[PDB]
Every structure is written in structure tokens, then in C-alpha cells.
């Protein structure tokens, strides 16, 4: 409806609105017809960007902006290991500082060298593995269920 078309093949936008964009780490828009083309040959690299990709490396993501597509996947990947709550901080200010640091990590993971990011990922991951990585995931997952329960009850 709003997207004018993919640089690789745009006929799908004019053909029908039911098809969805396929996201890649390349941060480059591709679509279902391109998926078939990459499976038969050159599955290891992007058709024009040349960036290497593990086979299709295609995932359904309907945002029009590939940066949001990439950032949302970065969001989950980053959040999955940065589940620290304000509970882990003495104040919302220090919590927001960490949260802003995560934004830096997100932006660095989005546009900068991943050396420091990777090191920081591993260090917090290994250190907080039990509480922030696992324990917070559980509590968070419980809240997802509890929210779904409230929604179910209202339904």
C-alpha cells in the first residue's frame, strides 16, 4: 500500500498486498520472489550488496523501514541479555543510564564496531547469566502470561 517497491523486484507490491518483506542482517529489503532466486544459486551472498548471508537468512518482518527491521531484531537480541530492571539499580536515574548505555550498544551494534559490544555482551551475559539472563526472562515471561490472562479474562 505505502511501499513503492523493492530495489530487487517491486512487482509484488503492485501484484498483491498479502505478501510480506523478508528481512536480513544486510539491512536490505528483499521479497519472496528473490527468496526463490537465492535458494537456487549464490545462497551465500546478497544479490547486489554482496554481503555474505547464511543461505536464505530471510525472516518475515512487515516494517517498511529496513533500519527498523534490523533494529527490532537487534532490540530483541540485545534485550534478551539486558533484562536488568530498575530493581537492579538504586534509582531510575542509574537505571536510565544503563538503559541509555544499551541504546549506545544498540546503535553500536547497528552502526559501529562489535568488538566492544561483543565483549560487553559476553561479560554481562556470563556474569548475570542466572539473574538478569535467566531469572529476569522468567519473571518477564510470567508477566507476559499474566497480561495474556487478563486479556483472556476480559475477552
Amino acid at each position: 500500500m505505502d511501499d513503492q517497491g523493492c530495489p530487487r523486484c517491486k512487482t509484488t507490491k503492485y501484484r498483491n498486498p498479502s505478501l510480506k518483506l523478508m528481512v536480513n542482517v544486510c539491512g536490505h529489503t528483499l521479497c519472496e520472489s528473490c527468496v526463490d532466486l537465492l535458494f537456487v544459486r549464490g545462497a551465500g551472498n546478497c544479490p547486489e550488496c554482496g554481503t555474505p548471508l547464511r543461505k536464505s537468512n530471510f525472516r518475515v518482518q512487515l516494517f517498511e523501514d529496513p533500519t527498523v527491521d534490523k533494529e527490532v531484531e537487534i532490540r530483541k537480541k540485545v534485550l534478551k541479555i539486558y533484562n536488568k530492571r530498575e530493581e537492579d539499580f538504586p534509582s531510575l536515574r542509574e537505571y536510565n543510564d544503563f538503559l541509555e548505555e544499551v541504546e549506545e550498544i544498540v546503535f553500536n551494534l547497528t552502526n559501529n564496531v562489535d568488538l566492544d559490544n561483543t565483549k560487553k555482551k559476553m561479560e554481562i551475559y556470563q556474569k548475570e547469566n542466572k539473574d538478569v539472563i535467566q531469572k529476569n526472562k522468567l519473571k518477564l515471561t510470567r508477566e507476559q502470561e499474566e497480561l495474556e490472562e487478563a486479556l483472556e479474562v476480559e475477552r
Binding site: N96, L99, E100, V102, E103, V106, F107
Partner: peptide, 9 residues
């Protein structure tokens, strides 16, 4: 305001 202080973020 959480971690939306940074204008770029």
C-alpha cells in the same frame, strides 16, 4: 524519560 533522553535514540 527512560532511555529516550538521547535525541538520536
Amino acid at each position: 524519560p527512560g532511555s529516550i533522553r538521547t535525541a538520536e535514540h
